[model samples]
Target: MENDPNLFVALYDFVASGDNTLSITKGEKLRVLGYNHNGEWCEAQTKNGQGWVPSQYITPVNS
Candidate 1:
């Protein structure tokens, strides 16, 4: 998992909390498609539409 920072170490630690949510945690990569709601609190994609993960979880890559 060290080579790939995207892969989960403890299995879905980022989204399992049920607060942040997660769309993608497997496969080669993850993508952000769209949001379920548009506002301060929004829903975003993670895996293949598997998550309605919150926007807060979304961040600029390498930022």
Candidate 2:
């Protein structure tokens, strides 16, 4: 997992809209790999599996 993917916190539950996508909800963890195309979408890895998610939902885990 890298070193490790940049850690992130899920702000809301997400249902994968299509194939090769990931799902996440609050109380879970996310690793935001990077954005897929533009700023609106991102590619990330969940404990569920690696796939695409919206950039807005997963916030960087900053201290």
Tens digits of per-residue lDDT for model 2, 1-63: 333447887889989887988888885778777786676777787778988887778777765
lDDT for each residue of candidate 1 in 12-52, tens digit (9 for 90 to 100): 33445565555334232444444555632334444344444
User: How many Å off is the CA of 42 in candidate 1?
Assistant: 6.2
**Residue runs of model 1 more than 4 Å from their true location after superposition:** 1-13, 17-29, 39-49
Global lDDT scores for all candidate models: 0.40, 0.78
Clashing pairs in 1: 23-46, 23-47, 23-51, 24-46, 24-47
- Candidate 2 Cα errors over 4 Å, as ranges: 1-5
Whole-structure CA lDDT of model 2: 0.78
Q: How close is candidate 2 to the true structure, as a TM-score?
A: 0.77
Rate residue 55 of model 2 by lDDT: 75
